[PDB]
Amino acid sequence: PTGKLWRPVGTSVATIDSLAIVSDRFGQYSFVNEGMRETFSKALFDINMWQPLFQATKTGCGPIVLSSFTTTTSGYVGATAGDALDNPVTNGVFISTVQIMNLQRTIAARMRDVALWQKHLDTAMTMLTPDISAGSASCNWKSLLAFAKDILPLDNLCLTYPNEFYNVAIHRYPALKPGNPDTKLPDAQAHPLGEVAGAFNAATSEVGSLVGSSSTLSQAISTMAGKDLDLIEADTPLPVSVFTPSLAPRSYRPAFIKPEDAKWIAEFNNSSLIRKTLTYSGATYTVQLGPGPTRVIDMNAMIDSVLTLDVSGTILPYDTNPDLSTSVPAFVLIQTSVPIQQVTTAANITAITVVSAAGASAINLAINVRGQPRFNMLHLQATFERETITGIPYIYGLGTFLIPSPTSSSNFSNPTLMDGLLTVTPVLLRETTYKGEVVDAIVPATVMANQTSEEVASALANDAIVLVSNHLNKLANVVGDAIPVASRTDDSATSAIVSRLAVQHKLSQVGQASPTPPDYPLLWRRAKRAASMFVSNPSLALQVGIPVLTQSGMLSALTSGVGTALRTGSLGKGVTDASEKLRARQSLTVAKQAFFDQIGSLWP
Amino acid sequence: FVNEGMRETFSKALFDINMWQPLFQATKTGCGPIVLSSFTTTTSGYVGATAGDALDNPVTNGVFISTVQIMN
Amino acid sequence: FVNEGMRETFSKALFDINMWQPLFQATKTGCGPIVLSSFTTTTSGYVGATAGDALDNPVTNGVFISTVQIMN
Amino acid sequence: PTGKLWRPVGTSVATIDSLAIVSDRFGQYSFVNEGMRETFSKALFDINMWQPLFQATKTGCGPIVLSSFTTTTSGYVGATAGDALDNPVTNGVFISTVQIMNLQRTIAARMRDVALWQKHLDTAMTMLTPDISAGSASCNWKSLLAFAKDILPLDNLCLTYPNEFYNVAIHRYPALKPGNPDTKLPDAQAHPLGEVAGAFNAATSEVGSLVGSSSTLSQAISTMAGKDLDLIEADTPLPVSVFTPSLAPRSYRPAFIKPEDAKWIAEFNNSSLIRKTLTYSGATYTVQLGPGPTRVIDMNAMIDSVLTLDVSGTILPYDTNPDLSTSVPAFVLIQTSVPIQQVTTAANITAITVVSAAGASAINLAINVRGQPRFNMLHLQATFERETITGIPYIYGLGTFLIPSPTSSSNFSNPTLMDGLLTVTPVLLRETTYKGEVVDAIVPATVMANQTSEEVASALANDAIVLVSNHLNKLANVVGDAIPVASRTDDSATSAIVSRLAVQHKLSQVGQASPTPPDYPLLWRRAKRAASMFVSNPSLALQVGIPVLTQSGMLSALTSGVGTALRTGSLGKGVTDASEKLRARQSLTVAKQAFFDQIGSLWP
Amino acid sequence: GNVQTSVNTYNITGDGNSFTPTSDMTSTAAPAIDLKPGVLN
Amino acid sequence: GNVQTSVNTYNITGDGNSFTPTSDMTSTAAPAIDLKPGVLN
Numbered sequence A, D: 001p002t003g004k005l006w007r008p009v010g011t012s013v014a015t016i017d018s019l020a021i022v023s024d025r026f027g028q029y030s031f032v033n034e035g036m037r038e039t040f041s042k043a044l045f046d047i048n049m050w051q052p053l054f055q056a057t058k059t060g061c062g063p064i065v066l067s068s069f070t071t072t073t074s075g076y077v078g079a080t081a082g083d084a085l086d087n088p089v090t091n092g093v094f095i096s097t098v099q100i101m102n103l104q105r106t107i108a109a110r111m112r113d114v115a116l117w118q119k120h121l122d123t124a125m126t127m128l129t130p131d132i133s134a135g136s137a138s139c140n141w142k143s144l145l146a147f148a149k150d151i152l153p154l155d156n157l158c159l160t161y162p163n164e165f166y167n168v169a170i171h172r173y174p175a176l177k178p179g180n181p182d183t184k185l186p187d188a189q190a191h192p193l194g195e196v197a198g199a200f201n202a203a204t205s206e207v208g209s210l211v212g213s214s215s216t217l218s219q220a221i222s223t224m225a226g227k228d229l230d231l232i233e234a235d236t237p238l239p240v241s242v243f244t245p246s247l248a249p250r251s252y253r254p255a256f257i258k259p260e261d262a263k264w265i266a267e268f269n270n271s272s273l274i275r276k277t278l279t280y281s282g283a284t285y286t287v288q289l290g291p292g293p294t295r296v297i298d299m300n301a302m303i304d305s306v307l308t309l310d311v312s313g314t315i316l317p318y319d320t321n322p323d324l325s326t327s328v329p330a331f332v333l334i335q336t337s338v339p340i341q342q343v344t345t346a347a348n349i350t351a352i353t354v355v356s357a358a359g360a361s362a363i364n365l366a367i368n369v370r371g372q373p374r375f376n377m378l379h380l381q382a383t384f385e386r387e388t389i390t391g392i393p394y395i396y397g398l399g400t401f402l403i404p405s406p407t408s409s410s411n412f413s414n415p416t417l418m419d420g421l422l423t424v425t426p427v428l429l430r431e432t433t434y435k436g437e438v439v440d441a442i443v444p445a446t447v448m449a450n451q452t453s454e455e456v457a458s459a460l461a462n463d464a465i466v467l468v469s470n471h472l473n474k475l476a477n478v479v480g481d482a483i484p485v486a487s488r489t490d491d492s493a494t495s496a497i498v499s500r501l502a503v504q505h506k507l508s509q510v511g512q513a514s515p516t517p518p519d520y521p522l523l524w525r526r527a528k529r530a531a532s533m534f535v536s537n538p539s540l541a542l543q544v545g546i547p548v549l550t551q552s553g554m555l556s557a558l559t560s561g562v563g564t565a566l567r568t569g570s571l572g573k574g575v576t577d578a579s580e581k582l583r584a585r586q587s588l589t590v591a592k593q594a595f596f597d598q599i600g601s602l603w604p
Numbered sequence B, C: 001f002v003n004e005g006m007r008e009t010f011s012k013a014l015f016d017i018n019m020w021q022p023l024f025q026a027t028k029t030g031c032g033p034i035v036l037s038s039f040t041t042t043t044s045g046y047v048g049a050t051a052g053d054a055l056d057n058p059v060t061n062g063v064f065i066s067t068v069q070i071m072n
Numbered sequence E, F: 001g002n003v004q005t006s007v008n009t010y011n012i013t014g015d016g017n018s019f020t021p022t023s024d025m026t027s028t029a030a031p032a033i034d035l036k037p038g039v040l041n
């Protein structure tokens, strides 16, 4: 049973309506199921432990028995009259609301009390590493004590109550074994209150540490089910939400990104220059679109973000072409009639809006750093919005210069300030971008081995690629973490892949002389580096031309392997290299024993 | 076998559903409160992981849930 | 009052739903087969449209469906 | 109960599983509920009637009692073990499958038998209108008979069995009253087997006809709930499906439709001519875009349809400008760089595809019809598809001419064949079009009083307007039909509106001298023509500038009135003008009595 | 088509099933149930 | 907020209700139910 206890308000006959939460002057009795007593007992148990320090310091008020907050009522206990009717409990143990209040504020008040002392006991305990993980190692007690008698700073609490803290301590450190009163010798065994827990944390030499290897697994299992690593290369529309894209604002360096390497950025590849004009704040400036191609951020295929083009440390040659100086650098949109990459001359450019200029010309924004005047780090920045560009077939964001007077000097300059580190930040997660279009769902499998070397590094913050990369990256840490894809152990991961290579290379051999019986020693090893190359750089699985990894099978395969692989690790997964791991722990205890030996001499 | 703690879960899961009782009736979905005592039974025998070790767990009228039930 | 023919409809309607019994269990929705005899009653009195004419229809243990039921 | 009968297969105790459809050597007994016996009895009853003709002609096989196909089993009868458990029926009457087969093929075999005779009886019966609808009117039997003894063609069956058909007849026509054997006189009352039914169909002088007025109502009620007339001016997105658009291919006459009168059709309003070229089937032709504006079907905002531009009977002046002749007329798409209505000269037109040319020049397609050579009716025709125009910001469908050699003669011609009757047929109902955009849902209330006089007649086949017109049109026939919106009876329809005008004109009077107390005699009459103008031309309610009808209240109001109005008509709704209607029926019976009077003399 | 077993009295992939239309029994559930005001009561 | 009456023991617009957070009882149902392999069994 569970929930609050109910009782037949109509008396005797208890039906699915003659019940009612048995409330009263104390609040409502909620049932205390077996396991929920484990907690409140485990919590109180950790407080009772500090008994010797509560009396010493006259705080506290006696040991806290959980049997002081409960009661022994009886009735039907459920979550609702209907279902509570199927849990007739007699003399169960319930805790009334007003009690659920004290057991709370008591464990809270006492928790402070101890939390404090417990902190002093520690700066003194750990102040001599009472924990080794291979074999033993003593340190003659006299010295030890006479030593901490020093180190411990005058405001601890282990100097005001030595054997009032010691008695608390003995129950937390199975290192300190108190000398028995009637034989005046230790005990071999150490009996700290955490008897079992402390036994099951020792780094057992057979397998690393059960508490470790156990969690590193349940931890990975969490992720595997959580983010949705499963279904990682699913071939079908998936809401961007399914990718929980967060804290995702990637930055670049356009005016370098080739147009074909990333759809969201077209260029004005035209013969001559395209000097246009525009009255901005009265003054008339001339946008240039200089000698080179001047790659500009396209506006369509640009998920309403927060574009913030930073222009700093980048050269600013106002020294040579004086034409450049005087011009306030500024991010400006450019609506063109004919599609760009077909826009020849000025009459082609519909209009030009200065979405964000920089007050003060190019001769105050400068700063000489050895001849080559740089740009005082400043951030121009628009706030592009999907629909502010409705209808408008062609429009481009360009972080240019806005020259107040074009001249012969700036005839080979080309004032694109795009060489600066632009940082787009998708401000509306629901919508992603792929191959130049804005969508609401991705098709994972499509984005695999479909980008090129740099059609990946040039991805646009929160676009399929960047999403089908953030995803693999989780799955990449589950294998990297739990599975042993980094040793000659032909693990579950590199194993799922090997079975694909076989089934694959086996049918490609079917029909024709079949002169080559499948290899296997070579297949195991080829798939080992395939699974390994993945854990290594999760990204690669997106680039066209990557051995194994990019065939449709793998990944879809890998994950579902790694999947079941985590759901069976056992507990002693740590047996892997638990030999050198062990031998390394003995190595430490031998060096730490060496320490105790000095504590033992210096302070005799 | 449905050991003590494993009933805590299925009860804690069903408990969180029963809570929504007033909305199940309102919208004619659901089908009454889900008691975990509708999926189990009261068989008795030896319960272990293998004949060898199951021999040391004679349980009488324990509460087990059959496979087809562990399905519902 | 639920005259003979008006039971034909509500039965014909429920009949077309009971049919889907195997799919209701499979998918844990539904809540058992819907018998029309769960919404009615067996009252008895005079049943008409107005005191005057209801006086000429003494029905004993007829099958009537109460408003709140005609709702479910 | 209903369904097949089940019985406890496990015996005695019948639980929700110890049941099983009681099948066997005869099939499965399905229960025959009270009403379902009414049908099979009503069907057999109509066959037994023809008893005298079955014996006469040695066919048949005795009267068909429905009690010959059933049985008296007993068990639980439901649709499934679970629910059949709540219908314990004892000695119910079930019909086994193999029986449900005969009662079927018997009623079918016999039905043919009678269907035939029953047809002969008729050509003779109705061959003297035995049905009047006001007062009576006889026709001395001798004459009548001695008359039909003539007319009836030699292959009837009423001449081979006179009083073998007569006996069947007497039961279908309460007009023929047989003379009683032991008083040798009629009976006043006529006792045809359809005693009641025939009584309740007579046009009762108090109210037209119960059978009529009753149905004309249930009929309207069907529609009202069906199509979804309710919710007719709902203000919120509605799937086009909710409008069941079918059999919907509207035709026009572009090159006339103003661009602003219908978004799906832009025009090349440019100064000079825009002669372009294109190699079509080797030969090089020149698309013209002549002197005038040349309105062309825009491609975007064009729901992938089946455009079929017919060019017939329309002038073809190859007589004057010889330039026109020789050019094969053809529907051609035109992708322009700069948006049309901004496309000045040839270099602007990206490309031109001849989506469908007409084989043979303009001098074989002609046909002289009094000087002015016309176009031999022929249909050019593309099959535009939403996505075949993906990306392509500007593209237009144009049914032009394709001149093989532009000349001075065709300098004021302008070869747009759009003056022809184009017929677009939406080939993909799911997607509609509104104000130039393609959507999947309409917002009804939005399309009311939002189109102009012709922003309606220029609507594009299966576009919101055409959908929010097909809808009102149903609701327009429900009122036109059921409700009396065509008499001074201030009906439920014109009444729902009057209450809106009041509540409306009443608050517009609130605040300020309120010198005008609402009228009402003038409001009733104004709303009467408002509801009337609607029934009249349902469309109007879309045009901006229509009195009353176009205020947001009405319609949303009207329908919900007309709604409840139909759900209460009573049965005697026909009482409306049931006076002149009656007086007109007596008028007919007086003229029909006049007929019987001649049948009575000529053939004595 | 994976075997079920009891949920429903028939397996789909069950032994000797048989798709076979007969002009005689035109398959039909219950769509035209009458509910209009006068007719439902 | 239209009156209901019995469906549920409390009316929303009912007499003397009271929204009033208390730092003391942080509202919470049951989200973290443990089901992982080792822990569920």
Ligand SMILES: *C(=O)CCCCCCCCCCCCC
Residues within 6 Å of the ligand: E001, E002, E012
């Ligand atoms: C297992 O599910 C394999 C697929 C066989 C049946 C799937 C559905 C197609 C056949 C329908 C049978 C029920 C009525 C169509």
Ligand SMILES: *C(=O)CCCCCCCCCCCCC
Residues within 6 Å of the ligand: F001, F002, F012
């Ligand atoms: C009637 O429904 C009027 C609206 C008042 C309550 C509607 C929902 C908003 C308040 C929620 C109460 C339940 C938990 C939020």
